[PDB]
Design a protein around this ligand. Structure first.
Ligand SMILES: C[n+]1ccc(Cl)c(CNC(=O)[C@@H]2CCCN2C(=O)[C@H](N)Cc2ccccc2)c1
Ligand SMILES: *[C@@H]1O[C@H](CO)[C@@H](O)[C@H](O)[C@H]1NC(C)=O
Ligand code: NA
Ligand code: NA
Lengths: 11, 28, 251
């Protein structure tokens, strides 16, 4: 339900 | 911070939010 | 938040969203107390009865948000956690006594119109403001009712309740490290925190210096916005000695 956040923050 | 609790879009501009007066009125 | 209203932009610039990396989900609310420290409820991070025990790498904090689900480009900041600190006497076995935790960010966050820390109370401000009848403000992206979710940050103002009434509303053992807030059944108006609001701030605006102070942390409640029940909040000032000790030692 949430908009995907920039992949940078998931690294 | 020395600046804590003062909101840029409210206290810092001397603008009040729509319901903060309800709080003030309760502080009797 | 039940029976609240949409926040104004920048109305709660200390509001923080605790966000699970996988799957991507809201976990809890929290608050910004300096450029590198965020305050939340311990049960947001640790609650063995529900197999909950998050590590630093499991989470992100999202600061400066308004929309619950949107990625707010050029407005919000997403921060990684360096370390979690849970109160050593947090009582998850019984009644959530001392339901408080600190999170240190990997890098300091930049303040903006939308991102700004709230004050923590001194003894005098606590003594002056934490009185039955005095109202504080609770904010969060949690459920809109007990049994859906808001589009943007919700806000509600609630009065602090006398201790005997808090105690008589519940079978749970209440401690000096908690206070309760909410309207009584005969008071007409209503409102409460709910699931998803956990860890968010209960704030009051000091009439002495016009600054906002975080007096409570959303902790627990039996149902949401039920008549004759009240929301319970961690008493931030009662635990300030631990807060200062953590920041002094690890800041
Ligand atoms: C339904 N509801 C209403 C208000 C809130 Cl703040 C919340 C968020 N807290 C919670 O869900 C907390 C976490 C552990 C159990 N919680 C509760 O609120 C329990 N429903 C009551 C409880 C209190 C203390 C010990 C055990 C059980 C939920
Ligand atoms: C929670 O996780 C940590 C890290 O693996 C572990 O050491 C701890 O025993 C777990 N349970 C707690 C803190 O109650
Ligand atoms: Na009781
Ligand atoms: Na109630």
């Amino acid at each position: 339900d949430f908009e995907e956040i920039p992949e940078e923050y998931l690294q | 911070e020395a600046d804590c609790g003062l909101r840029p879009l409210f206290e810092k501009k001397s603008l009040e939010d729509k319901t903060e007066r309800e709080l003030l009125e309760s502080y009797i | 938040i039940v029976e609240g209203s949409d926040a104004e932009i920048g109305m709660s610039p200390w509001q923080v969203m605790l966000f699970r990396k996988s799957p991507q989900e809201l976990l809890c609310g929290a608050s910004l107390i300096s450029d590198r420290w965020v305050l939340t409820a311990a049960h947001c991070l640790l609650y063995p009865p529900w197999d909950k025990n998050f590590t630093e790498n499991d989470l992100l904090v999202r600061i400066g948000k308004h929309s619950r689900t949107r990625y707010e480009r050029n407005i919000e900041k997403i921060s990684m956690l360096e370390k979690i600190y849970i109160h050593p006497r947090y009582n998850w076995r019984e009644n959530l006594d001392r339901d408080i935790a600190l999170m240190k960010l990997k890098k300091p966050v930049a303040f903006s119109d939308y991102i700004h820390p709230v004050c923590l109370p001194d003894r005098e401000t606590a003594a002056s403001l934490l009185q039955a009848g005095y109202k504080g403000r609770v904010t969060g992206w949690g459920n809109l009712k007990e049994t859906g979710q808001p589009s943007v940050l919700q806000v509600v103002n609630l009065p602090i309740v006398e201790r005997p009434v808090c105690k008589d509303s519940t079978r749970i053992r209440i401690t000096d490290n908690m206070f309760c807030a909410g309207y009584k059944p005969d008071e007409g108006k209503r409102g409460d925190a709910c699931e998803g609001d956990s860890g968010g701030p209960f704030v009051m605006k000091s009439p002495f210096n016009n600054r906002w102070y975080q007096m409570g942390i959303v902790s627990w409640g039996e149902g949401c916005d039920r008549d004759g029940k009240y929301g319970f909040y961690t008493h931030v000032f009662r635990l300030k000695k631990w807060i200062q000790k953590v920041i002094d030692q690890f800041g």
